[PDB]
């Protein structure tokens, strides 16, 4: 057991972690900035500590401030949630230095999987398939670069090793723009992640983003909980995630899952992770791994009945895995929709006061959000304000429940992307299932 | 399926029926009174028809009005839900004769099981044990009455045959007040239900109200779906239900379920019904059967995964039961709390506008209600404004989840029994479980 | 009524040492900039300098009490 933990995050994940803590009887410390005093989890937390001013670089990315909050409150662990410092190896080792428990993998594990150039190598060593590509960082040897591009086959995509959030990616169709594309990708990587390293990979045009969720306790045990299907993306930022992935037969599911679990055992992984694969022609092609709880993880919780955050807390506390591989059973189909706060026709964030708010209810509808009537959405942080997960005995029931629950939801005073979700739900190809990662941009066409 | 149906009810059950209809692609007609034009299901329904003035006796109990509303809109079914006309055999026969499917049991079965004396006789015939009692309507032979009372053993209780809602029941300790109690209970029954028939039954002082859910398609098939322990009651009205009942081993569950399914097959039951019981010394004693979907069915839905109202709609359409008895699996534990708009101390209704409202959410928490910010709770109807169901992998997880959800619920502008529910949740004996049907009243210490 | 706010999360102290004289006290006034109180965070004793000359109107936090960011520490004038 953990006596007390610090929720070093905000918004929906902070509520999730606080609520799991309350269930497990763990005392919660909610560190916030000076503009986050109004957050629902901050008002529901046992102790609250204002760690910095509004900007993220001064409040939530401030490792010393979070450590000081943990120190003064006498906490024993720190849950980073997702975003900010969840995948920060410096945060991991700096939290572990000071005698605090980092709820997540080890610092070395985050360093290894944190740069895709090394993660791909580790996966190839472990037998997990990977997309053919540069198989190494890109240098200035332009002749070698073009030879590699010819070998793999055009088109090609340049991806930053430290890239995240869908940025720092450029698609190159020919040698004409290769150098300029590489230069601009390096510049963006320098300006964003402080790492100009880039690598080139084959650009599959009809894949399906299928990711595996795995729980490992760091003691030689690891399990895999079904998968997901995040193929409904815009600008490489997911919009609708669902599990289990349609069309993935139990044979293929087990084949990929057991290999993922073996790979987890290979690197001595700990906590909850996620392997991201591209599905095409029945072959999986690893692209990256997320060493943290994923935003869309609630879909995996509603089909297996396994609370992932409580599993993370138990694993951090030292207890081994209490779930056997045979005990995991997929019963149903869940569909999630991220409700952002932005102009639906311009995808620009829209901060402002929420005058009316009414969350939907019903049998199998989960609403995961921190907003409430009279909550002023701040402009400093990301635009996501909630998630809506609907569950049913089959995909059609889940989609119908989603369509019902999207109409019953009211959010006034700010420009939110609920109508986009409603029109995505009504799309016929989506109802068919198995659409590709580029389908949504084609549907919008602009 | 049914082309269109009429929801001859109001409040939470109306939303439950509307949502089940929407998921199934069924059009909905929402009949309402003149004071219920702001109900959520009325504003979400496909069609709306006003059937009468504010009082229930003129609008929601006006069988001709509901039949007319079904006729003009071209409906093909009428779903009564619970209360009002759900257990009105006259309504069933009139609806079926007019040419509309009645979503529920047959008129003959409603007549048979509604009369508690005939229900007890049929249960004894079919092999269902019953509480020792008069075994027939009370006569004028006071000598025989007192002889039977002495034989079974005092105390005894006089219950109206057509009684409901916990009214028209009187407990007798000895022969002194038997005649006067019987006469006054008969007068009360005349005043309330227009039926003075009464019967006498043995009074068990430490029972546990256990009820079984049975689904039967009326074609010779019937199944049972776990049970529910509605022990926590005040004034003979349930406050907290849960499912499955603690301490009822699977052997007893299968035993009573097989007996109840056989009884349903024998008496040609159709639809969804509930067999109430009293549990003591490992033996059940039938008391009454509810020929309608019950207020606390969501717990059964959440533990078994079977949508009961959708099953009702499918059975009414004639489809045979697609769920076998072996395919019904109980997985977890659900606890439900009824939220009423009343004084937590004086237990009197508190109608009024709701100035603010923020419903609870999270993992494994269902909020089934019809209120919103600005809703004006009318004084003409029952005081229930919603139900709150929480599900977990065991009783303790579900109760902790319930505590969090109750702490998270806001209802202002009226007086609501939320603090009482929190108190019940915090009771140590309730957390241990197995409390008797009289525990809550004794908890008040009066 | 100027209010001096703590610039970091830590524990508030008046004496630079456990058994030393307090830096300031209500009444006795201060200058534009000088040590006024201590906020300890991860060791590394930190000194809070006033940003305004004035008299110490009052002090709002006792010694040993953890303080947060933008915690009112003292009131000057």
């Amino acid at each position: 057991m953990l006596d007390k933990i610090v929720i070093a995050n905000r918004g929906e994940i902070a509520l999730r972690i606080l609520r799991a803590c309350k269930e497990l009887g763990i005392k919660t410390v909610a560190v916030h900035s000076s503009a986050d005093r109004d957050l629902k989890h901050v008002l529901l937390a046992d102790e609250t500590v204002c760690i910095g001013p509004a900007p993220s670089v001064k409040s939530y990315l401030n490792i010393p401030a979070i450590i000081s909050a943990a120190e003064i409150t006498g906490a024993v662990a720190i849950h980073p949630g997702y975003g900010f410092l969840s995948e920060n190896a410096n945060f991991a080792e700096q939290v572990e230095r000071s005698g605090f428990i980092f709820i997540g993998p080890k610092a070395e594990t985050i360093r290894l999987m944190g740069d895709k150039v090394s993660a791909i190598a580790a996966m190839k060593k472990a037998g997990v398939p990977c997309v053919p590509g540069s198989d190494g960082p890109l240098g200035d040897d332009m002749d070698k670069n073009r030879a590699i591009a010819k070998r793999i086959g055009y088109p090609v995509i340049i991806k930053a090793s430290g890239g995240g959030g869908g940025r720092g990616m450029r698609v190159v169709r020919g040698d004409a723009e290769l150098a300029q594309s590489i230069s601009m990708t390096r510049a963006e990587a320098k300006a964003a992640f402080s790492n100009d390293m880039v690598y080139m990979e084959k650009y599959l045009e009809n894949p399906r983003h299928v990711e595996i969720q795995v729980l490992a306790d760091g003691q030689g045990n690891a399990i895999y909980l079904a998968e997901r299907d995040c193929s409904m993306q815009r600008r490489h930022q997911k919009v609708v995630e669902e599990a289990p992935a349609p069309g993935i037969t139990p044979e293929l599911r087990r084949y990929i899952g057991e290999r993922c679990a073996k790979a987890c055992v290979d690197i001595g992984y700990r906590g909850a992770g996620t392997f991201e694969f591209l599905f095409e022609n029945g072959e999986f092609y690893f692209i990256e791994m997320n060493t943290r709880i994923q935003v869309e993880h609630p879909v995996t919780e509603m089909i297996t009945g396994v609370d992932l955050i409580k599993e993370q807390l138990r694993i951090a506390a030292g207890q081994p895995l209490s779930i056997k591989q045979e005990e995991v059973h997929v019963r149903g189909h869940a569909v999630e929709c991220r409700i952002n706060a932005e102009d639906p026709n311009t995808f620009l964030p829209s901060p402002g006061k929420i005058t009316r708010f009414h969350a939907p209810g019903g049998f199998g509808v989960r609403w995961e959000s921190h907003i409430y009537a009279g909550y002023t959405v701040p402009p400093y942080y990301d635009s996501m304000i909630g998630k809506l997960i609907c569950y049913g005995e089959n995909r059609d029931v889940a989609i119908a429940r989603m369509k019902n629950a999207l109409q019953e939801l009211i959010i006034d005073g700010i420009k939110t992307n609920v109508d986009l979700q409603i029109r995505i739900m009504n799309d016929e190809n989506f109802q068919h299932g198995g659409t590709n990662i580029h389908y949504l941009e084609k549907k919008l066409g602009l | 399926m049914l082309d269109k149906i009429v929801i001859a009810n109001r409040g939470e059950i109306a939303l439950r029926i509307l949502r089940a209809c929407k998921e199934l692609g069924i059009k909905t007609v929402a009949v309402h009174s003149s004071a219920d034009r702001d109900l959520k299901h009325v504003l979400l329904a496909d069609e709306t028809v006003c059937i009468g003035p504010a009082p229930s006796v003129k609008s929601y109990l006006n069988i001709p009005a509901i039949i007319s509303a079904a006729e003009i809109t071209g409906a093909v079914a009428i779903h009564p839900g619970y209360g009002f006309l759900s257990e009105n055999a006259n309504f069933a026969e009139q609806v079926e004769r007019s040419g509309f499917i009645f979503i529920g049991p047959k008129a003959e079965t409603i007549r048979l099981m509604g009369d508690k004396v005939s229900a007890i006789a049929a249960m004894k015939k079919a092999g269902v044990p019953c509480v020792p009692g008069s075994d027939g309507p009370l006569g004028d032979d006071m000598d025989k009455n007192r002889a039977i009372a002495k034989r079974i053993g005092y105390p005894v209780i006089i219950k109206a045959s057509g009684g409901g809602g916990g009214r028209g029941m009187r407990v007798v300790r000895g022969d002194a007040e038997l005649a006067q109690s019987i006469s006054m209970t008969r007068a009360e029954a005349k005043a309330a239900f227009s039926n003075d028939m009464v019967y006498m039954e043995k009074y068990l002082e430490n029972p546990r109200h256990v009820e079984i859910q049975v689904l039967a398609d009326g074609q010779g098939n019937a199944i049972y779906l776990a049970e529910r322990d509605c022990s926590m009651q005040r004034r003979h009205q349930k406050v907290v239900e849960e499912a499955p009942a603690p301490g009822i081993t699977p052997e007893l569950r299968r035993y009573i379920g097989e007996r109840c399914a056989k009884a349903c097959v024998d008496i040609g039951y159709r639809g969804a019904g509930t067999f109430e019981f009293l549990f003591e010394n490992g033996e059940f004693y039938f008391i009454e059967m509810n020929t309608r979907i019950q207020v606390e069915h969501p717990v059964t839905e959440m533990i078994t995964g079977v949508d009961l109202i959708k099953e009702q709609l499918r059975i009414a359409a004639g489809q045979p039961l697609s769920i076998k008895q072996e395919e019904v699996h109980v997985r977890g534990h659900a606890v439900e709390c009824r939220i009423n708009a009343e004084d937590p101390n004086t237990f009197l209704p508190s109608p009024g506008k709701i100035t603010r409202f923020h419903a609870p959410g999270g993992f494994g928490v269902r909020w089934e209600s019809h209120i919103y910010a600005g809703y004006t709770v009318p004084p003409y109807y029952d005081s229930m404004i919603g139900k709150l169901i929480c599900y977990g992998e065991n009783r303790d997880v579900a109760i902790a989840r319930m505590k969090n959800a109750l702490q998270e619920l806001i209802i202002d502008g009226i007086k609501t029994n939320v603090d009482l529910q929190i108190r019940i949740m915090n009771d140590e004996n309730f957390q241990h479980g197995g409390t008797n049907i009289h525990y809550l009243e004794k908890k008040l210490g009066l | 009524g100027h209010i001096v706010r703590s610039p970091m999360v830590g524990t508030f102290y008046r004496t630079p040492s456990p058994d030393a004289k307090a830096f300031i006290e209500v009444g006795q006034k201060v200058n534009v900039g000088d040590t006024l109180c201590i906020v300890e965070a991860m060791k590394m004793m930190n000194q809070i300098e006033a940003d305004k000359s004035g008299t110490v109107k009052a002090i709002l936090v006792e010694s040993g009490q953890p303080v947060e960011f933008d915690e009112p520490l003292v009131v000057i004038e």
Partner: peptide, 21 residues
């Protein structure tokens, strides 16, 4: 009504030890 919370203060008695180096 968790929206209006008292904004209580932290209990100083809680102590955590960080290595000096």
């Amino acid at each position: 009504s968790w929206i209006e919370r008292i904004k209580s203060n932290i209990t100083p008695t809680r102590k955590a030890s960080i290595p000096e180096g």
